[PDB]
Design a protein around this ligand. Structure first.
Ligand SMILES: C[C@H](CCC(=O)O)[C@H]1CC[C@H]2[C@@H]3CC[C@@H]4C[C@H](O)CC[C@]4(C)[C@H]3C[C@H](O)[C@]12C
Ligand SMILES: C[C@H](CCC(=O)O)[C@H]1CC[C@H]2[C@@H]3CC[C@@H]4C[C@H](O)CC[C@]4(C)[C@H]3C[C@H](O)[C@]12C
Length: 121
């Protein structure tokens, strides 16, 4: 996994969330990938990951990187914002994500870390 590829994957992830391209998001993940979101138990496998992002995309998510991606030794991490409006109220969440890649270049472990203080009205 080159740093260029892992960085491009982060970009394609951010772009697929923006397009609502659920297939495009899921295609980045290994069939047995595990995703850990703050405040929930982890979920594993294509079906669960697709269901998480489908429910997430019920919101009009606008996403963008806020710093350069960090990529080395089969892993990447990135800082970003997700903005949405729901029932007329605007929220911006600022996580840090971490992706771990398998030899085939697919995400096999992903984490989103965010707290109360990173959820802004
Ligand atoms: C309960 C709070 C509002 C609390 C508050 O305003 O103080 C709101 C804020 C964001 C809302 C969620 C946004 C995404 C989803 C939209 C769906 O159409 C209904 C379920 C979800 C999961 C909503 C559930 C719930 O309606 C939430 C969590
Ligand atoms: C879909 C992104 C990105 C996930 C990732 O990169 O791993 C995540 C990051 C922050 C997430 C939000 C955090 C606060 C809320 C938690 C609720 O229980 C469900 C709706 C909300 C509004 C979440 C919706 C969605 O799950 C978000 C917007």
């Amino acid at each position: 996994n080159t740093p260029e590829h892992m960085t491009a994957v982060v970009q394609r992830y951010v772009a697929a969330l923006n397009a609502g391209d659920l297939d495009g998001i899921v295609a980045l993940y290994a069939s047995d990938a595990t995703v850990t979101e703050s405040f929930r138990p982890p979920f594993t496998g294509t079906e669960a990951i697709r269901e998480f992002y489908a429910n997430s995309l019920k919101l009009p998510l606008a996403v963008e990187l806020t710093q350069e991606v960090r990529a080395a030794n089969g892993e990447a991490a990135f800082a970003f914002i997700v903005s949405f409006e729901y029932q007329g109220r605007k929220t911006v969440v600022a996580p840090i994500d971490h992706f771990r890649f398998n030899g085939a270049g697919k995400i096999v472990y992903a984490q989103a870390l965010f707290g109360e203080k990173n959820i802004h009205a």
